[PDB]
Amino acid sequence: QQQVTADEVGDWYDKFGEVYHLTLGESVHCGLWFPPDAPVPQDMELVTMSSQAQDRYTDYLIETLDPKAGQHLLDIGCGTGRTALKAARQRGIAVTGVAVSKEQIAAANRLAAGHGLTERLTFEVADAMRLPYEDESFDCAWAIESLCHMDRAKALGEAWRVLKPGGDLLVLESVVTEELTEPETALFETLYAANVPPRLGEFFDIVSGAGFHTLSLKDLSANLAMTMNVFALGVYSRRAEFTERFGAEFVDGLLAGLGSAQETLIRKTRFFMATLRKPAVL
Amino acid sequence: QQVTADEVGDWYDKFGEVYHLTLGESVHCGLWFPPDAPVPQDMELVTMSSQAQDRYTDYLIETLDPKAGQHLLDIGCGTGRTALKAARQRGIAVTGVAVSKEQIAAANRLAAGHGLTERLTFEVADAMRLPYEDESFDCAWAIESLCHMDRAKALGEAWRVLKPGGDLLVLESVVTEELTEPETALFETLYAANVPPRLGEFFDIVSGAGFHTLSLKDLSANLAMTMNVFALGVYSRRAEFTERFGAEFVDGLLAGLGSAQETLIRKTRFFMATLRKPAVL
Amino acid sequence: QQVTADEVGDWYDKFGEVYHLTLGESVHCGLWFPPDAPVPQDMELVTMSSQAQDRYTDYLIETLDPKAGQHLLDIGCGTGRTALKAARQRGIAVTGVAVSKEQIAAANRLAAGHGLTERLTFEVADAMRLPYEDESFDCAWAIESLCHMDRAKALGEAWRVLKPGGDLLVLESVVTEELTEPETALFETLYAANVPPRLGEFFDIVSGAGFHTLSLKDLSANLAMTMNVFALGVYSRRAEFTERFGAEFVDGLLAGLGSAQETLIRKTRFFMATLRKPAVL
Amino acid sequence: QVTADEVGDWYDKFGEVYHLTLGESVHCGLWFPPDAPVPQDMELVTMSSQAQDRYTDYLIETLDPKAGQHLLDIGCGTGRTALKAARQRGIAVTGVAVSKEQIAAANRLAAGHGLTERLTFEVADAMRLPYEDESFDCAWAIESLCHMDRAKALGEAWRVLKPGGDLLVLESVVTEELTEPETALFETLYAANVPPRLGEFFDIVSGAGFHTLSLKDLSANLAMTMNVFALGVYSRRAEFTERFGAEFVDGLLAGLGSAQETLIRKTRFFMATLRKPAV
Amino acid sequence: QVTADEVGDWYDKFGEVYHLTLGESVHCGLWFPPDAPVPQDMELVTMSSQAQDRYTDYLIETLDPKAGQHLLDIGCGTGRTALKAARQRGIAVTGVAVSKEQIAAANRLAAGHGLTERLTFEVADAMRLPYEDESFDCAWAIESLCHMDRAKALGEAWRVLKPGGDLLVLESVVTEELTEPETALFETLYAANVPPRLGEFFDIVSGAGFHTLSLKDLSANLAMTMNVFALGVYSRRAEFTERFGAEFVDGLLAGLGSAQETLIRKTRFFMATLRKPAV
Amino acid sequence: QVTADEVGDWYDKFGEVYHLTLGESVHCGLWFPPDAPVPQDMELVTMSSQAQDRYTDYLIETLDPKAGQHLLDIGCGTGRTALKAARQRGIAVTGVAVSKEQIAAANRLAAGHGLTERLTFEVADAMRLPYEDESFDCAWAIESLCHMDRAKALGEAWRVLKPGGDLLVLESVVTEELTEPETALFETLYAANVPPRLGEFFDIVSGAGFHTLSLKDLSANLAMTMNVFALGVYSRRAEFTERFGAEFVDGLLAGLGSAQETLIRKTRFFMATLRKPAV
Ligand SMILES: C=C[C@@](C)(CCC=C(C)C)c1ccc2c3c(c[nH]c13)C[C@@H](CO)NC(=O)[C@H](C(C)C)N2C
Ligand SMILES: C=C[C@@](C)(CCC=C(C)C)c1ccc2c3c(c[nH]c13)C[C@@H](CO)NC(=O)[C@H](C(C)C)N2C
Ligand SMILES: C=C[C@@](C)(CCC=C(C)C)c1ccc2c3c(c[nH]c13)C[C@@H](CO)NC(=O)[C@H](C(C)C)N2C
Ligand SMILES: C=C[C@@](C)(CCC=C(C)C)c1ccc2c3c(c[nH]c13)C[C@@H](CO)NC(=O)[C@H](C(C)C)N2C
Ligand SMILES: C=C[C@@](C)(CCC=C(C)C)c1ccc2c3c(c[nH]c13)C[C@@H](CO)NC(=O)[C@H](C(C)C)N2C
Ligand SMILES: C=C[C@@](C)(CCC=C(C)C)c1ccc2c3c(c[nH]c13)C[C@@H](CO)NC(=O)[C@H](C(C)C)N2C
Ligand SMILES: Nc1ncnc2c1ncn2[C@@H]1O[C@H](CSCC[C@H](N)C(=O)O)[C@@H](O)[C@H]1O
Ligand SMILES: Nc1ncnc2c1ncn2[C@@H]1O[C@H](CSCC[C@H](N)C(=O)O)[C@@H](O)[C@H]1O
Ligand SMILES: Nc1ncnc2c1ncn2[C@@H]1O[C@H](CSCC[C@H](N)C(=O)O)[C@@H](O)[C@H]1O
Ligand SMILES: Nc1ncnc2c1ncn2[C@@H]1O[C@H](CSCC[C@H](N)C(=O)O)[C@@H](O)[C@H]1O
Ligand SMILES: Nc1ncnc2c1ncn2[C@@H]1O[C@H](CSCC[C@H](N)C(=O)O)[C@@H](O)[C@H]1O
Ligand SMILES: Nc1ncnc2c1ncn2[C@@H]1O[C@H](CSCC[C@H](N)C(=O)O)[C@@H](O)[C@H]1O
């Protein structure tokens, strides 16, 4: 009886209800983006909900690789340290993370210090294609969405060298399914930091050449497409803020490229989580 | 091998924090789809959202728990995919009412295409004056539709058509702030209005219709993510939707969605409650 | 072999309906203890009731979900076993308050007996005038204690001492009828009173303190079974209790529990709600 | 309303009645698992019925009968157990009982939920089963063996079972020796036959030809069920005297007191899976 | 009948044989999960069959065929996998195999269960499927791809699948290079075709047009099954020579041990889910 | 590469060897649950050892020892079961055995894992335990009662157990009568004592003062372990003769098949939880 009548609502759905079906799917209600057992976020900015989704992602990687208490883990391209902190907190392990970014490693040590875990969390500026660690120093390791900045043959061989025999390396890598055009290969360099993904058979030829066995692979491509959407929406809606922080040239490059890059990702690539084992004894 | 380590190092120094501004406290994907979920047919935003909708529907079915051979009233049934899934999964008959001829036509087409026109009935009817008798339905649900209705009439109507002891599942929004007058109007201009009630106000209505309250569970994040998915689809497909629904309609969406997203985040909450019509001992 | 088939048949011919009147639509045991629960140490009603209490505590910890290194306020902490189990299971510090000197002393000795006096602090304080300062605790819970206090004051005082973004678990009763004056008095003479408010009234209080509502789940059948266990122990051990608490107290319970049981069944509900103090920005 | 100091003196003097009656905490027990449904009402009889249905769900789940099989309910009662098994697993259930009332009330169930070609309820003796050898796939005697001769009934259940099928048994057993007033209380309150000893019971199970595959103690469930039964009789003495007669109620009251102590201290109650071997 | 200072003597001398054979403990292995049912007997072939059925269940759960769909069983054997899938998911299953004896046994099995309308079994070659383009919703090749040209079989599976359907594949792959005697053993013992390599196999998968959604190693199940098979042949040489001829059995006896070592040290066995893309 | 026609004729002749050895299907058995980790190698000893550890994890889960308790391992072997229990549950374990070598290997294990303060391994007899009355909160006898006088062992375990504590027992029991040659094979192959009967065993359990809280058949697990053991002895006759002597190995090769049949046809093996009643 309030500001709308039934005939107004039915006429509205007669004219426009198909916009909900074109955007949300074969029904006209919410999607269950957060599982029921998940907790209610602190706030509801798109960044916070995305952040909780990231933590659940990290929980799933921990669960998959299954590091055991008292083991030492290597975070290949550790970003700003949250993944390692959660893995160490949950499994009671030591974690050493490497990254080529100074500010990133500083924020990761700041993080370890804020939680009183500088004795079990070690963050250093190192190249994954030339690790500064001995042979067989780590029980397990993971390359979470980092291999696309590196030579995969060098990074995988180096990870094989620093792993104890019988240990596992969890990999989160992308793969092309169709042949990319040259403009698409350039968007990899200009938008993010480059290296087009290899092919599926090509990627596992490199994994075999590094001396790894393959124990599992699981497609998570939808998760990459939703995250790339969350990103593109945040950039579109906050152009002024991001231009005042990162510049016009950078932001304008994202606005002009994110569309074509999303279509490329949707139609031509796949993203997966693979478990690689260094064989025991040889 | 298109870049070197130092190039990548410099890039994440200058820009790496843009991922922290958009994606969260880490720099990787979110687990938007649970691990046991099937891979979608497409990676289009609509197809991914559609699978999230169906998992949403699986959850509501699980929560209300209709038993085989029961009759369920779908208050504001849309185009009937919720009713179809509930019918296939539990072996129930479902009657859905909506005020849109087009939606009811689509829901009847759906029941015919799936050969279930004897277990799925879809009628054009008002929930605030349901034509059905008294104590006709074992359970019912109003999935995101009370916001179009006067909730006191619709909940009393739902109570009357429910057999004593059955349950009505409700997916309703509620204000936490006061709402400015421009914010109240956006409900009417963007969607089809009725500003959400207050918590105590809503449950005074729930009691006034004679319902007990069995459960309530917040789902505000699913609504904020869904509204996000909607806003992204409108933003990126403006040309297509203007050619389909007219410039005036899409322009209004482009003009209001940001402010409506802000109001939803900061002033409302969205929940799934189970109301019970008390049984006579 | 002290019965024949004819005798057992004639017995159920004459009397089987007493089982159906007492135990339900079946003539066998109830699954009162889930299959994965351990076999109790004995079979006294009190110990079987206590194991159900611990599983009750286990479920509250699972629902509130306190994380390691946090500080939890127990509003009406009793003798502190709830605080102890939460502390042992989650690696948290717990500060419990109560207005009874005997309970706080027993709670402090429970912390000393388990060697946890440094993580468990029990003090004699009022929940409507908490002595702790603003934003002191990460989370809190009031387990069946709000019926002794002014709910508006206790909740506002719980809101003040919580850190923004923390959660308060509440186990509260609510009326569904109006309550006669003899019943409202029975609250005072049997327990320690305060008739329960109404659903919308309670949530107007919860909103008025500043809380958002995230979950509600009905646990009325649990409170009814607990109350039934309580009444059976009083009926079965009148002589024991009159020698310990005095004839006046026990007789008052004997005279009131039947009427209180009916009032609880037909006029009240009992739920567990999760209230959040809002967050930053 | 009340003041704080009133509440403080109250628990200072009466708080321990809760620990004497409810346990080492001062709150509710989780008597109903969180995933269970909110009952239609809060009456002791209705809540107790829901726990009976959860009990029945669990037995079906334990025995795990398969679709298209035929199950024997030895001592079917009024047949709600047999009904829930038939709806949930798509099986046929034949129930027997020595009571014309309970078989009548069970046919009252086979009628409505339109089955009759699946369900079945007959007045028969378990120690004298009328059925043909090797006719069933599974069976169960749910709290019923205490009215019969366990040796005859179990041998009779073995004969009617196909080789390879399973017999679920919900039986009680003594852990002490039992005095004569206790053994008589078994006959005057219920319908008698004192429980055997554990090794004794399984010598019988072996003698009928059964292998043992499982055993699980449910004695806390029987103690709670008997506490609920006691509370109902205590609170409704006038109602049950107006129905069953004063003789019944008076004997119940006296026996119930000095029977709960014997059940708690001298008996155990369990669910056992017995198998008829299949070479 | 024995004493302590006699059992300890025994373990002082031989306890190491328990560790050499069974592992780092001296007790049983949990070979059957605690929720599995007791087998009908304890013969090795039965316990292995129950594991085979639980294996089938896992494949059903993995591919997840939905009610009303049509499933192609590429290399269906004698059809028990097709039977369970049809009964459990309400689907239609068409299975092909190049063995006339197996297909006869599979249609015989379908007739005995009354499912000849939902179970079709034909003699055909998976490298030359006679079926129409986009005829099946889903498909699976259970341990059959080692008898085929995997490029011809996967492209032909890709053609007969509807766009968006899934193909479950159970395949082996080498991790070392293999000597010539080992490659020969593949042909003489079983029906041959040495497994490809990992990137080589997925070059084939991508070339047929399949996207790869999952891969899961099951190599221990294959090695444990190969041992159960070898122990069966070792134990019943006389029985198997009387039915399959001395030439066949002596070949298995002379090659099983070396083939086991090749399997252990040079090959891995996985379940993988391949999707035909939908546009 | 081999062709189709050849594969067809191959299964036409040799197909049924799989249904005779592997079961009603022609594929792998799910010997390892899907959530189990991939073993380090594929040797039969390593896969069996992983099965042994999941077995231990199950016994731990079943007895459910709580942090800070003291467990008595009766017949503790070389200590890995005690180590896993101490690591997972944060408990102290005391294990006894009559074998000096085994105890030395367990004290070795405690030292290497730095758990000598929580792990104690001593040479003692379960039928004459040296510990005081009511010393341990729980205990378990994992496949070791077969070496002892079960009456003496159980009553002894009862004495050292605190009231209310539990004893996990993994015992076998005869279902047939056993010929005298089979009884002798118990003594010569292992270290003897024929198993008791089901009612006999529980007359002892009750004679020792224990209540029975559970029983679960695990016969398939023991039977498969005995097959794993037999295959290993068969396949490594040369290595084991060079290690333990020809006399011992020839005895195993002569008796293992007969013992296998006896175990399959005449005995069952189960896990039972016994409780010392509380006061
Ligand atoms: C959180 C999502 C952000 C937005 C940020 C974090 C990760 C970075 C910058 C590498 C992301 C961007 C680009 C990304 C990926 C990836 C995960 N997240 C990716 C997969 C990546 C693995 O190496 N490979 C690819 O090719 C993709 C894409 C073009 C298919 N890519 C270059
Ligand atoms: C699928 C999401 C779409 C986008 C479309 C389908 C549903 C419609 C049009 C009602 C949606 C829009 C507005 C919506 C909601 C709702 C769910 N979905 C909502 C909750 C609604 C329940 O009554 N209440 C509200 O106030 C909200 C919002 C402003 C908080 N609202 C008016
Ligand atoms: C363990 C059950 C004992 C018996 C004891 C522990 C708790 C006390 C004394 C407060 C109990 C008594 C009265 C109780 C409740 C309650 C839980 N347990 C209650 C719910 C309470 C929450 O505030 N509200 C009510 O109104 C109820 C009832 C009349 C509906 N009440 C006054
Ligand atoms: C629902 C509980 C009611 C109250 C009613 C239903 C069952 C009947 C009447 C047999 C019950 C009464 C007596 C009962 C049992 C039993 C279950 N329920 C029992 C176990 C029974 C199994 O044969 N054995 C016994 O000895 C017990 C008891 C004295 C240990 N008994 C005689
Ligand atoms: C039940 C196990 C039996 C013994 C029988 C059933 C299957 C047959 C005859 C193909 C088997 C034999 C050989 C087998 C396999 C296989 C599964 N079972 C295999 C995996 C196969 C998949 O293509 N690939 C291989 O290479 C293997 C092996 C040498 C690694 N192989 C040729
Ligand atoms: C693990 C496998 C090994 C092979 C070795 C470890 C355990 C030993 C030697 C006791 C084993 C052998 C004989 C064994 C058992 C047993 C478990 N493992 C048994 C059950 C035992 C329990 O008391 N009882 C029996 O009689 C059996 C059998 C003949 C039925 N037995 C003498
Ligand atoms: N060659 C290289 N050696 C080491 N780290 C590298 C690298 N190239 C890129 N990286 C690092 O890999 C990271 C990829 S972003 C992923 C961050 C982190 N794995 C997370 O999940 O949050 C960046 O932090 C970048 O600094
Ligand atoms: N007064 C009223 N009476 C009955 N239905 C109404 C109504 N006002 C709005 N509706 C219907 O409620 C629906 C809300 S959109 C939700 C659609 C559906 N519940 C789904 O889950 O997909 C629309 O179909 C609209 O037609
Ligand atoms: N000798 C006998 N033969 C067959 N049934 C008997 C019997 N003696 C008693 N019974 C039946 O066993 C039942 C025990 S009461 C248990 C009822 C039912 N199994 C339930 O769970 O609800 C009674 O209904 C009684 O009629
Ligand atoms: N005004 C008040 N402020 C703080 N605590 C109070 C109070 N009024 C009553 N209480 C306490 O609240 C408790 C309720 S009984 C609940 C005990 C405990 N929470 C448990 O879970 O077992 C009593 O112990 C009483 O001492
Ligand atoms: N080229 C080919 N085309 C079709 N089927 C083939 C084939 N080569 C072998 N096969 C079949 O593949 C089967 C391999 S044994 C696997 C049997 C079945 N998948 C099961 O799970 O039991 C054999 O039955 C054989 O008949
Ligand atoms: N009389 C006795 N007293 C104590 N231990 C005995 C014994 N007789 C045999 N044992 C021990 O019981 C063990 C049986 S082998 C079982 C090993 C261990 N329990 C495990 O689970 O792996 C041997 O270590 C043997 O030394």
Q: What does the H/E/C string look like for chain A? A: CCCCCHHHHHHHHHHHCHHHHHHCCCCCCCCCCCCCCCCCCCCCCHHHHHHHHHHHHHHHHHHHHCCCCCCEEEEECCCCCHHHHHHHHHHCCEEEEEECCHHHHHHHHHHHHHCCCCCCEEEEECCHHHCCCCCCCEEEEEEECCHHHCCHHHHHHHHHHHEEEEEEEEEEEEEECCCCCHHHHHHHHHHCCCCCCCEHHHHHHHHHHCCCEEEEEEECHHHHHHHHHHHHHHHHHCHHHHHHHHCHHHHHHHHHHHHHHHHHHHHHEEEEEEEEECCCCC
Bridge partners, residue F216, by sequence? D214, F271
DSSP string, E192-234: ------HHHHHHHHHHHT-EEEEEEE-HHHHHHHHHHHHHHHH
Residue type, B165: G
The greatest distance separating any two alpha carbons of chain B, rounded to the nearest whole angstrom, comes to: 77
Residue C214: its chain A contacts at CB < 8 A? 40
Give the burial class of E128: count Cβ atoms within 10 A of its Cβ; 0-12 exposed, 13-18 middle, 19 or more buried: exposed
> What tokens does A152 get?
């995969």
> Which DSSP letter does residue D65 get?
P
How far is E126 from E97, CA to CA, in rounded Å? 8
Q: Which of F234, F231, F235 is nearest to F223 (CA)?
A: F231
C106: its two tokens: 């027993």
Residue C236 makes CB contacts below 8 A (sequence gap 6+) with C45, D257
Q: Is the CB of D126 under 6 A from ligand 9?
A: yes
Q: Which helix (H) or strand (E) holds E132?
A: none
How many other C-beta atoms can be found within 10 angstroms of the C-beta atom of residue A45? 18
Whether the Cβ atoms of residue E262 and residue E278 lie closer than 8 Å to each other: no
Residue E90 has a CB neighbour count (10 Å cut-off) of 13
Amino acid at F70: H
Enter the tokens of residue C168. Answer: 């308060």
Q: Tell me, what amino acid is at F54?
A: R
Measured distance CA(F275)–CA(D217) in Å, rounded = 11
Structure tokens at B161: 């058509």
User: Could you give the angle at the alpha carbon of E247 between the alpha carbons of E243 and E248, nearest 5°?
Assistant: 60
**Residues having CB within 6 Å of any atom of ligand 8:** A 6, 9-10, 13, 27-29; B 76-78, 82, 97-100, 103, 126-128, 143-145, 148-149
Q: How far is CA E5 from CA D25, D220, E12, E25, F147, in A?
A: 52, 44, 11, 22, 11
| 8 Å CB contact between D154 and D203 | no
d(CA B16, CA A103): 9
| Cα of A45 to nearest chain C Cα, Å | 10
What values do phi and psi take at A92, rounded to 5? 60, 55
- Asked if C200 and C174 touch (Cβ cutoff 8 Å), the reply is no
Q: What is the rounded CA–CA span in Å between residue B92 and residue B173? A: 28
- Which of C238, C270, C266, C264 has its CA nearest to residue C253? C238
State the distance from the centre of ligand 11 to the C-alpha of E74, rounded, in angstroms.
7
* Structural tokens at position F195: 């198993």
What distance in angstroms lies between residue A145's CA and the mean position of ligand 1's atoms?
6
Q: And the tokens for F241?
A: 């003769």
Could you say which of A8, A18, A124, A145 is catalytic? Answer: A145
Is ligand 11 within 6 A of the CB of residue E53? no
What is the DSSP-derived secondary structure letter of residue F24?
Answer: S
- Residue found under tokens 């279902």: F175
A149 CB burial (10 A radius; 0-12, 13-18, 19+)? buried
Cβ contact A–D (≥3 pairs, < 8 Å): no
Q: Which helix (H) or strand (E) holds B162?
A: none
How would you classify residue A38: left for phi > 0, otherwise alpha for psi between -120 and 50, otherwise beta? beta
Tell me which amino acid residue A107 is.
A
Experimental method: X-ray
- Contact partners, residue D61, CB within 8 Å, separation at least 6: none
Nearest CA among B238, B263, B258 for reference residue B248:
B238
Q: After which residues is chain E broken (C to N over 2.5 A)?
A: none
Mutate to test the pocket of ligand 6, among F145, F190, F229 (most ligand atoms within 8 A of CB): F190
- Name every residue whose Cβ is closer than 8 Å to that of residue A198 and which is 6 or more positions away in sequence: A152, A175, A176, A206
B32 residue type, one letter:
W
Cα(A257)–Cα(A235) distance, integer angstroms: 11
Q: Which residues of F touch E232 (CB under 8 A)?
A: 20-22
The half-sphere exposure of C16 on its side-chain side, counting CA atoms within 13 A, is: 26
Residues forming beta bridges with residue E93, ordered by sequence position = E71, E119
The minimum-distance atom of ligand 1 relative to the CA of A145 is 22
From CA B191, how far away is CA B147, in angstroms rounded? 10
Q: Whose CA is nearest to atom 31 of ligand 2?
A: B147
C181 contacts: CB under 8 Å, gap ≥ 6:
none
Give the C-alpha distances (Å, rounded to integers) separating B134 from B87, B120, B164, E183.
22, 20, 10, 77
Q: Are A57 and B30 within 8 A, CB to CB?
A: yes
DSSP state at residue D124: -
Asked whether E105 lines ligand 11 (CB < 6 A), one says no
Stated in angstroms to one decimal place, the resolution of this structure is: 2.8
Helix (H, G, I), strand (E, B) or coil at C130: coil
CA atoms within 13 A on the CB side of A150: 24
Is residue A140 within 8 Å of residue A163, measured between CB atoms? yes
The CA distance from B54 to B34, in Å, is 13
C-beta atoms surrounding A117 within 10 Å: 18
Q: Which H helix or E strand runs over F143?
A: none
Contact between A184 and A268 (Cβ < 8 Å): yes
Residue F74 vs residues A102, F129, F221: alpha-carbon distances, Å: 58, 10, 21
**How many beta carbons lie within 10 A of that of residue A179, not counting itself?**
8
- Alpha helices in chain E, H assignment, sequence order: 4-21, 44-63, 80-89, 100-112, 150-160, 180-189, 198-208, 219-235, 237-244, 246-266
Distance (Å, whole) CA F165 – CA C41: 9
Cβ-contact C94, C87 below 8 angstroms: yes
Mutate to test the pocket of ligand 4, among D146, D174, D221, D270 (most ligand atoms within 8 A of CB): D146
Could you give the C-alpha distances from C91 to A88, C66, C67, C72, C143, in angstroms and in order? 16, 9, 8, 11, 20
Ligand nearest to the Cα of F21, by number:
5
Residue C82 annotated as lining a ligand binding site: yes
Residue A20 CA to residue A3 CA, distance in Å, equals 22
Chain position carrying tokens 């060897």: F17
Q: Is the CB of B117 under 6 A from ligand 2?
A: no
Please give the Cα distance from D219 to C33 (Å, whole number).
Answer: 10
Burial class (CB in 10 A: 0-12, 13-18, 19+), F111: exposed
Q: F46 touching A, CB under 8 A?
A: no
A191-A195-A198 Cα angle (round to 5): 130
| Residues in Cβ contact with B20 at an 8 Å cutoff, skipping those fewer than 6 apart | A80, B27
Cα separation of A189 and A180, whole Å? 13
How many residues in chain F? 279
Work out the minimum CA distance from C58 to partner chain D, whole angstroms. Answer: 9
Which H or E run contains C201? helix C199-209
A219 contacts chain F (CB < 8 A):
no
The answer to whether F121 and F131 are in contact (CB under 8 A) is: no
Ligand 4 pocket, residues with Cβ under 6 angstroms:
C 19, 23, 27-29; D 143, 145-146, 171-172, 190, 195, 222, 225-226, 229, 263, 267, 269
* Cβ neighbours of F104 (radius 10 Å): 15
Q: Which one, of F272, F278, F277, lies nearest residue F150 by Cα?
A: F272
Q: Which two tokens stand for residue D56?
A: 């029945």
Separation in Å, CA A175 to CA A196, E206, E213:
9, 11, 12
- Give the SS3 label for residue C136: coil
Of A261, A57, E138, A262, nearest in space to B43 by CA: A262
Instruction: Please choose, from the candidates C174, D34, C64, A40, the residue with its C-alpha nearest in 3D space to the C-alpha of residue B217.
Output: A40
Scored b (16 or more CB within 10 A) or e, B32-58 reads: bbeeeeebbbbbbbbbbbbbbbbbbbe
C-alpha span between B26 and B14 (Å, rounded)? 16
d(CA A44, CA B173): 15
- CB–CB of E132/E70 below 8 Å? no
Residues of E in contact with B38 (CB under 8 A): 64
> How many angstroms separate the alpha carbon of residue E21 from the centre of ligand 1?
48
Q: Which residues of C touch F276 (CB under 8 A)?
A: none
Q: Is A221 on the interface with B (CB under 8 A)?
A: yes
Cβ contacts of F223 within 8 Å, gap of 6 or more: E42, E47, F260, F263, F264
Contacts of E192 (CB under 8 A, 6+ apart): E146, E147, E186, F1, F2
Tokens 């040799």 belong to which residue? F14
Binding-site positions of D for S-adenosyl-L-homocysteine: 11, 26-27, 77, 81, 98, 102, 125-126
Shortest CA gap B135–chain A (Å) = 24
Quote the CA–CA distance of C22 and B182 in Å, as a whole number: 60
Nearest CA in chain F to E25: F80
Rg (CA), chain D: 21
| Long-range pairs, D18-21, Cβ under 8 A, ≥24 | D18/C230, D19/C46, D19/C79, D20/C46, D20/C233, D20/C237, D20/C240, D20/C241, D21/C45, D21/C46, D21/C49, D21/C229, D21/C230, D21/C233, D21/C234
Residues 6+ apart with CB under 8 A from C129: C157
Can you read off the two tokens belonging to residue C100?
A: 């009874």
Residue F113: HSE in the Cβ half-sphere, 13 Å Cα cutoff = 19
Among D24, D43, D132, D143, the one annotated catalytic: D143
Question: Which of F48, F102, F142, F146 is the best mutation target for the ligand 6 pocket, counting ligand atoms within 8 Å of the beta carbon and taking the most?
Answer: F146
**Which residue is associated with the tokens 């229990």?**
F85
**Cα(A151)–Cα(A136) distance, integer angstroms:** 21
Backbone CA torsion sign across F145, F150, F156, F160: positive
Element spanning C104, H or E? helix C101-113
**Residue E152 near residue E181 (C-beta atoms within 8 A):** no
User: 3-state class of F88 per DSSP?
Assistant: helix
Ligand 12 contact, F93 CB (< 6 A): no
> Domains in chain A, start-ordered, CATH in brackets?
44-282 (3.40.50.150)
The backbone torsions φ and ψ at residue C2, rounded to the nearest 5 degrees and listed phi first, read -105, 15
Specify whether the CB–CB gap between A62 and A94 falls below 8 A: no
For every residue of C75-91, DSSP letters joined together read: ET-TTSHHHHHHHHHHT
Residues 6+ apart with CB under 8 A from F89: F60, F65, F66, F67, F69
End-to-end CA distance of chain F: 75
Token pair listed for F232: 């290993």
Q: Which residues line ligand 6 (CB under 6 A)?
A: E 18, 26-28; F 143, 145-146, 171-172, 190, 195, 222, 225-226, 229, 263, 267, 269
D30 has a chain E CB within 8 A of its CB: no
CA dihedral sign, ordered A60, A65, A68, A70 = negative
